[PDB]
Amino acid sequence: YDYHFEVNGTVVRHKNKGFGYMERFFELKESCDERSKLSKKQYERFNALFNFFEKNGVICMAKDAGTLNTSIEINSLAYHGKYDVMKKFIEEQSVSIEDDYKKAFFLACLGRWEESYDLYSNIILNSIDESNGCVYYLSQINRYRIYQSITQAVTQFNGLGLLTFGRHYKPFTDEFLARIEREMTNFNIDDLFNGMPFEFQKKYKILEFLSDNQFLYDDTVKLFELTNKVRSEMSEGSYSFGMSSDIVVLLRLYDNLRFLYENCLWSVSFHEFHQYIRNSMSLLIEKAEYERTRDIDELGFSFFGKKSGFFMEYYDFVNISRHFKIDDIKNLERS
Amino acid sequence: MKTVIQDTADVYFKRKSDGKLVFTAEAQTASFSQAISEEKLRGGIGNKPLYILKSEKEINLTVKNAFFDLEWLSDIYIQFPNVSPSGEFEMSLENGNALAPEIKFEALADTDTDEMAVVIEASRDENTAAPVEDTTGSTQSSDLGGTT
Amino acid sequence: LDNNVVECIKEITESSRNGKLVFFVGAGVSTLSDYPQWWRLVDKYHEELYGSPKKGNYSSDEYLRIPQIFYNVKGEMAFDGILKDFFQVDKPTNPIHDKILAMNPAHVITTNYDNLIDTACWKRGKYFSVISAEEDVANATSSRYLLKVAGDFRKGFKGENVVLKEDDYLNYDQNYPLISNLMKTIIATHTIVFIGYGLGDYNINMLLNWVRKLQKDSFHKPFFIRTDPSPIENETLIYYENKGLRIIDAASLIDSNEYDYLERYSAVMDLLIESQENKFITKDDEVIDYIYGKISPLFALQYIRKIDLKHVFE
């Protein structure tokens, strides 16, 4: 917490006492002459950092505050619906353990949840001879989540709508539904980050939240900035400027979808994450309808000549198409 | 149309004395979260009848990332009369072939209450809300740029 | 059931929920996973030094010496080749290894030199840091160790990595100083439950001889799960309970045959796992005294929230 990394791509000094190490780094971006006077080992390390902060969208400090209008790209076949290329990636016999990790995500998106559970089980056996241990943690998480997805489906194919809909019985046999359960007793999900070494608990501390059943509580609470935007509409004359609390909601949605898909995490299929996308997108259509019908303004014309307005694009369409029901779209179409 | 892309600005808290209008120092503040809010309900006065209904105007503001706020560049005991002054505002805009609309607020009180946070340091970026006061004169003015 | 075997399972389970339990795992819990025993390995050395297998079945334990002679005459490469032939295999994980881990042991110590209890805790997700030679004691990652006191074959299938010969028990304290010093500290600070040894094992009587050098009431007394098919005679039980052990005899609990080893380990460990669930509470003062042990610290608080009680009663 030495620096406060905002969502727009800026940096604010937060609790840095001594030499500000993020001030010098962005100077080394901007001044190419200063970039020259280094050594010939800390220069190849600079190319690694420059390619990191440009794919993670950390542009600059806030002191200069360059005008930014950054967009979103989610490099994942699973987000875009490429089911055919996912299948001809499953058949392509893999070469790497961080490539079997992508198939067991892609198998899970295809509903082959038996072969997902097993291929994640090979990755757990086969990640012994690996230094970082990232694929060990994110495979225990994904296999537990794919276990929870099976233990629900046994209550729907035998439960409410079980009657005559075609393959009316179970898709998971008795030998498999017993084999998974005997393996998954006393897997404390809360005791997964703690069991990993103290090197994993400091070089990879940011994955602490994925080991919790209550995950995205820390993002449902911050979506209570929805009250900050019901407040500006209710006060009915409130003219938020700059990065308003609307754009914080959109840039924080995008920064959660891009994480969970590009890291191939299976929690993106659950209902907790769908309701987060519903509640955040519904708010943004609401602030669009409020703005297109605001009651002009007698005095605010010194700033309110026009507004560009919330407009839809392609990633805003896939999110309403994947994460809403027909009953939820009809609530937005009524309001 | 004309390239109106102007959203954020920089607001100038000017200076007045306890019974005077000194303007010499300044205590200006950066970007404004800017919940500028005109809940105007000011009313016409009728000739023959009278009414005591709710009829008045008001202007609320707020800002963010305050700076230049120390000495303007121990009797711990609060009293009910106050003779505190009211710093005049300027708001300097940009992004146009014309100059800024340069919206001035003439007399301004300061209405923020303190609040203690569990995390640290009470905010990542502080805020000073600021209402607009009037006795017998104007409450705001727009100095449209025109040239330059 | 007995009067003291009800007291043992209470005292194991009051140490598992405190996180002070360490399962010393012996050779027999690796035998239930059909790993090769060492007599199958000492016969093969006898089948090469002398040409014929042994008919006189090793009375009075001269098979402490057979691989020492095979090492000293023939090559160390010849010793290491036969260790490769037997031990470079891959066997499953018996259901006892799922029961060791289910009691949430703080550490596990073992005299095994297989990777079986290694590969059982990966597959369960509780991470343990392996300590198999002297260099790893200082580089130990976590606060949760897996102490193979007789080495492992992870670095290589060579006789220098695993204590097997006669000379590796003589020159052991010299050669492995930090592991022995770490094992002795884990015992002094934990509740030890032995599983899969016999009463006349070397690695049990090189410890009851150490424990004799301690004070009268310093240490806790280690439990012992005796799973030999005959019942214990009551005079053997008198000796070894006055030496420091507290034996839990599997034959005195359940009756099974003279070869159902797997039934008697699954007898005692399932009497351990199930006592946590705790289908053993019966009486009316056993209901009051469960609840009084879990609410009585809350009299110094003034008002507990009705939903923090879900954390109280687990």
Question: What would you note in describing this structure?
Answer:
This is part of a larger assembly, with two copies of chain A and one copy of chain B (148 residues). Chain A is mainly α. Chain A is built from 16 helices and three strands. Chain A has helices at 21-30, 32-36, 44-55, 77-80, 83-90, 97-109, 113-126, 134-153, 174-184, 200-203, 217-220, 226-234, 245-262, 271-291, 315-323, 326-334; strands spanning 3-5, 11-13, 238-239. In chain A, strands 1-2 form a two-stranded antiparallel ribbon. Chain A is globular. In chain A, 17% of the residues are buried. By secondary structure, chain B is mainly beta. In chain B, 0% of the residues lie in helices and 16% in strands. Chain B has no helices and seven strands. Chain B has strands spanning 10-13, 36-38, 59-62, 89-92, 103-105, 129-131, 140-141. The two termini of chain B are 19 Å apart. Chains in contact: A-B, A-C. Chains A and C meet through helix 7 of A and loops of C. Strand 3 (238-239) of chain A pairs antiparallel with strand 2 of chain B, so a sheet runs across the interface.
Short description:
Chain A has 335 residues and is mainly α.
Distance between the termini of chain A: 41 Å
Helix content of chain A: 40-55%
User: How many strand segments of chain A?
Assistant: 3
What's the tally of helices of chain B? 0
Choose one word for the global shape of chain B.
Answer: globular
Annotation, overall tally of beta strands of chain B: 7
The arrangement of helices and strands of chain B along the chain is EEEEEEE
Structural class of chain B comes to mainly beta
Specify the biggest β-sheet of chain A: 2 strands, antiparallel
Radius of gyration of chain A: 24 Å
Residue share in β-strands of chain A: under 5%
Order of helix and strand elements from N to C terminus of chain A:
EEHHHHHHHHHHHHEHHHH
Helix tally of chain A equals 16
From the alpha-carbon coordinates, what is the Rg of chain B to the nearest angstrom? 18 Å
Structural class of chain A: mainly alpha
Biggest sheet strand order of chain A reads 1-2
**Biggest sheet character of chain B:** 4 strands, antiparallel
Instruction: State the assembly state of the protein chains.
Output: part of a larger assembly
Distance between the termini of chain B: 19 Å
